[model samples]
Target chain A: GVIDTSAVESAITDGQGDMKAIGGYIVGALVILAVAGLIYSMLRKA
Target chain B: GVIDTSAVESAITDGQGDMKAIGGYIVGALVILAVAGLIYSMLRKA
Candidate 1:
């Protein structure tokens, strides 16, 4: 039956919110990481 | 006797605004470059 994937979809899927939150978290993480990396590189050179 | 470059500077020097504007532009450019890089890398991988 190949797990009948189409029959397993959620009627009230929170996927949109989940994806948005995840994307936001990722961007936030990237910003923090960039700042931390910059500081680290500066201190390392200093 | 080199003219004192510092003394020749403007008292009402709009340097502060210029520096702020330049710094903001640099940050904005970096963000755009980063996003472009990310998309390019993803597309390359795909």
Candidate 2:
């Protein structure tokens, strides 16, 4: 393999921060989706 | 601080899958947002 196991482990460990960031991003997107869905409903109703 | 360290480690390990899922969701929402923004721009130009 071109990549070493140590590097892979490092990446996975570094993923700790990204995991938290991903969680936040997911929550933010969910909020956006909810609001967009509401807007979509209103547009349909209008 | 009563929780055991091992349990926290186990949870974090379990959270790895959710982390990846969250990353996917973030990407999905971003794609939606990009497409919506493009449509809005086109509608404005029309």
Candidate 3:
């Protein structure tokens, strides 16, 4: 009776949302790297 | 007394470990992309 399922469920949901936000940030960083790489290649060609 | 703390603790521990495993996989993929980018630059130089 002490361990309320609602609290646990909410915590899990919050954790998942945090994970997703972190994942999105990681993808954004990767995209920046991709763009930088593209610019580097362009510079090398010129 | 009705809620078994042991089970809840175990579940939380398992979830945290799963998160770490997934995070490691994401980092590994990022590393692979870095390596590939390095190789790409090498190709351009050669």
Candidate 4:
């Protein structure tokens, strides 16, 4: 009923939030993988 | 050869590109480490 609610629905219908969320997820996964690898290597070497 | 040299020098002088190059190298290294670890884990588990 409110314009604010309409904007939220519009963003969902246009898939902007989905795109941003997916992009964030991908980057987060890569970062996590990188950090995990680095720690593993350090531990292995130790 | 007559004029391209100046642009090349300018590009190298301030080191802006060098920062991006180093950033790329860091990301590249992380990706390599991640892949290497993945392989090692797979081999170890196998």
Candidate 1 residue lDDT tens string, B1-46: 1222332234213443454455455566666666787778889988
What would the per-residue lDDT of candidate 2 be over residues A17-43, giving only the tens digit for each residue? 566655565565565556556655544
What is the lDDT for B45 in model 4?
A: 93
- Kept native contacts, fraction for each prediction: 0.00, 0.00, 0.00, 0.00
- Give the residue spans of candidate 2 off by over 4 A: A1-46, B1-4
Tens-place lDDT digits, model 3, residues B1-46: 5767898787787677656655565565565556556655554444
TM-score for candidate 3, residues paired by index: 0.42
Query: How should the candidates be ordered by TM-score, best one leading?
Result: 3, 2, 1, 4
Which tens-of-lDDT digit does each residue in B14-35 have in candidate 4? 3444544554566667667777
iRMSD (1 decimal) for each model: 23.3, 11.2, 9.3, 15.6
Task: For candidate 1, state the interface root-mean-square deviation in angstroms to 1 decimal.
Answer: 23.3
Ranking by lDDT: 3, 2, 4, 1
The worst-scoring run of ten residues by lDDT in candidate 4 chain B lies at B1-10
Q: Where does model 1 exceed 4 Å of error? A: A1-46, B1-13
Residue A9 CA error for candidate 3 (Å)?
1.7
TM-score for each candidate, following the candidate numbering? 0.34, 0.35, 0.42, 0.32
Model 1 Cα lDDT, one tens digit per residue, A1-46: 4575553365224455445555454565455446655744544333
Q: Using lDDT as the measure, which candidate wins?
A: 3
Pull out the clashing pairs in model 4.
none
